[PDB]
Design a protein around this ligand. Structure first.
Ligand code: WP2
Ligand code: WP2
Lengths: 266, 270
């Protein structure tokens, strides 16, 4: 991968691997999420920010601040097959004083056709208090200098599904997987359940009949809390075809995340 | 990747990704196993065998025969870091009347140094009866044409750890992770727990104190049974600047053996 000529976006290509495809003989949602993370990490490295998954500047590390996910939204028009080459372009934009947006466009490298797009909201959190913390414009300029000046939106449409609020589904959920436990292999380099594990947990709540007849066009997650190594999680869904999702701690009922998935017939 | 000029081995390169590394800031055992599977599958495709995970010839499909894993052995000298390019060469050999061997050599592409190696034993099973089978000469000839005539060994040493028998550890096990359940994400394209999931389950049984101070140099798994979507598994280990563990994967209800293993560990000094 490489910064673009203007230095305000980053591009990387991948050849889809046989083990990265699922039941529909195309790349899994988890593979797509992993590729989005990979090009984002290579972009952070290329502009001199942390590569630890907090993507920090010098001054954020001084101020005990880290970037954390508020929302992730992925839309897939066509899943690539084993051996397909995909090119992902990614860039960041200001999202108010508290936040940044990271966007991605996924192309079939051979045709140049857009096969998917994604957007994410990040907020600045004090690592000691877990509170959102605003910093002055001079700290923000450290990262805003690596973002396009003129807005580039992967989701330029007026009332984008990517910004649509997710309500809390009412129990009992129509579909549920109770008592899910993270594995060592599910933990990031900070002992928190990684994003691909949340995606897997969300998909566990989908009825098999849907998995057998449909594929996922969009997934939206709003994150509230991290899941710890010893946490036990219930993954719930109901129809809102479209589903609402809710991930909650088995004991307390405390919200981990909520989500929306949209499905298209195979 | 690509067949080599002589058409008797296959080579593929990979750039290690940020998400493929674990606590030691180098590629996980799971990533290595995935790369070994990937170059094996690309090789099968390049010689016109099935890519469904059974690597069948024309005559095997006629006879309702599939390759299944009896043993997998991985040895890692050095795990590659994020951004390292690794090149894996793989090839197959006849393994007596009982089956075939697939071997791999893993090189750091930058230096050309061997950083690891792997071997696997496969046996022929009738996919309807689950009964093992000695290989017909018709099936033998269909694959032997794609194998070196003089055997190449990734493990050419005398009394290789790769061929060492694994005993059944005695219960109670020193260390255990009970009631492991496969996820949809852990299923192969035939609804069976995939190989990387077994490796992960084996490593769940290792004490955290070992994970914190050592890294894995070798893993050996002997496979007995496939784990189904609704199966619940217990992962057991006991001890057997170096340390070794016996492993046993068994069904929670019946106690039936899924697989057994051995892992060998090396102390990290930094
Ligand atoms: C994709 C990913 C995985 C872990 S954190 C994360 C992030 N995605 O978006 C963020 C928000 C700010 N930022 C820094 C940053 C710029 F602000 C501008 C240009 C390059 C650059 F790295 C990010 O990378 C965090
Ligand atoms: C690596 C892997 C993942 C799923 S099944 C599998 C196999 N690895 O070894 C086997 C044994 C036979 N065989 C066919 C074969 C040759 F016999 C010779 C040359 C190329 C070639 F594909 C294999 O690939 C099965």
């Amino acid at each position: 991968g490489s910064l673009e000529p203007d230095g305000l976006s980053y591009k990387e290509s991948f050849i889809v691997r046989s083990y990265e495809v699922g039941v529909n003989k195309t790349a899994t949602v988890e593979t797509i999420a992993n590729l989005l993370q990979e090009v984002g990490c290579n972009h952070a490295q290329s502009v001199g920010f942390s590569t630890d998954g907090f993507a920090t500047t010098t001054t954020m590390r001084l101020l005990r601040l880290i970037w954390v996910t508020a929302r992730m939204h992925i839309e897939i028009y066509k899943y690539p097959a084993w051996g397909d080459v995909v090119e992902i372009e990614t860039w960041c934009q200001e999202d108010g004083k508290i936040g940044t947006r990271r966007d991605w466009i996924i192309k079939d490298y051979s045709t140049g056709v857009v096969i998917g797009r994604a957007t994410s909201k990040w907020v600045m959190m004090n690592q000691d208090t877990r509170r959102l913390q605003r910093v002055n414009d001079e700290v923000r300029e450290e990262y805003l200098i690596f973002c396009p000046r003129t807005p580039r939106l992967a989701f330029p449409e007026e009332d984008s599904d990517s910004l649509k609020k997710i309500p809390k589904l009412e129990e009992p959920a129509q579909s549920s997987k109770l008592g899910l436990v993270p594995r060592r292999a599910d933990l990031d380099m900070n002992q928190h359940v990684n994003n691909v594990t949340y995606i897997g947990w969300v998909l566990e709540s989908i009825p098999q009949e849907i998995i057998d007849t449909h594929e996922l066009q969009t997934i939206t997650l709003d994150y509230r809390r991290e899941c710890q190594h010893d946490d036990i999680v219930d993954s719930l869904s109901s129809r809102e075809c479209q589903f609402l999702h809710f991930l909650k701690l088995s004991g307390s009922g405390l919200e981990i995340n909520r989500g929306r998935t949209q499905w298209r017939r195979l």
